[PDB]
């Protein structure tokens, strides 16, 4: 199938299912659609927003990566054995660029700030094979070291933009994007 998920990235077939929009019949990633069970989404993000939607923006790409990262971690019941193993689960190795390395590091840092990922010195043990991730208390996860990482599904500091399962309205989607703009501002 031709995948037309709004993230506009390949996703490894072992990391996600494919779902179909009932309204426009296109295929999307289950990771980007809340891991919602089953084969369908009643209306995809584009169909809910309507034709004026612009998925090309940096902030919308940040949003979809956050959603994808959270839902992969939820499906995996925690963090993979290393940063690069996580990266190569979220994306196809061959498609990885500096822009999306930065974006994935932003997602990891954000989920750590939000209390979804909780890193500590030595959950799952995680090898740091990429520099540039900052987390509370520890600060920078040092390349070449290992840390323990505890994943929890929700926290009082989480953001709804990655916890919400499905798109429900144009205003909801706009608020998702506003949330990520705010996170970047504070980042
Ligand atoms: Zn996607
Ligand atoms: Zn659709």
Residue numbers in the entry: 319 to 440, 460 to 524
Q: What does the study report here?
A:
In S. cerevisiae, the HORMAD protein Hop1 mediates the enrichment of axis proteins at nucleosome-rich islands through a central chromatin-binding region (CBR). Here, we use cryoelectron microscopy to show that the Hop1 CBR directly recognizes bent nucleosomal DNA through a composite interface in its PHD and winged helix–turn–helix domains. The Hop1 CBR comprises tightly associated PHD and winged helix–turn–helix (wHTH) domains and directly recognizes the bent DNA on nucleosomes. In S. cerevisiae, the HORMAD ortholog Hop1 contributes to axial element integrity and acts in the very early stages of meiotic recombination by mediating the recruitment of the DSB-forming endonuclease Spo11 and its accessory proteins.
We could purify the isolated S. cerevisiae Hop1 CBR (residues 322–537) but could not identify crystallization conditions. After screening the equivalent domain from several budding yeast Hop1 proteins, we determined a 1.5 Å-resolution crystal structure of the Hop1 CBR from Vanderwaltozyma polyspora (residues 317–535; 34% identical to S. cerevisiae Hop1 in this region) using single-wavelength anomalous diffraction methods (SAD) with the two natively bound zinc atoms (“Methods”). The V. polyspora Hop1 CBR structure reveals a compact assembly with a PHD domain (residues 319–374) and a variant winged helix–turn–helix (wHTH) domain (residues 375–439) with a C-terminal extension that we term HTH-C (residues 440–524). The N-terminal PHD domain coordinates two zinc ions through seven conserved cysteine residues and one conserved histidine residue. The wHTH and HTH-C domains fold together, with the HTH-C region forming an elaborated β-sheet wing on the wHTH domain and a long C-terminal ɑ-helix stretching across both the PHD and wHTH domains. Examining our structure of the V. polyspora Hop1 CBR reveals that in Saccharomycetaceae Hop1 proteins, the PHD domain’s canonical lysine binding pocket is poorly conserved and largely lacking hydrophobic residues. This lack of conservation casts doubt on whether the Hop1 PHD domain could bind a histone tail equivalently to other PHD domain proteins. Moreover, a comparison of the Hop1 CBR structure with those of DNA-bound wHTH domains reveals that in Hop1, the canonical wHTH DNA-binding surface is partially occluded by the PHD and HTH-C domains (not shown). Thus, if the Hop1 CBR directly binds nucleosome-rich chromatin as suggested by prior studies, it likely does so in a manner unlike canonical PHD or wHTH domain proteins. The overall structure of the nucleosome-bound S. cerevisiae Hop1 CBR in our cryo-EM map closely matches our crystal structure of the V. polyspora Hop1 CBR (overall Cɑ r.m.s.d. of 1.06 Å), with the most significant difference being that a disordered loop in the HTH-C domain of the V. polyspora Hop1 CBR is well-ordered and interacting with DNA in the nucleosome-bound S. cerevisiae Hop1 CBR.
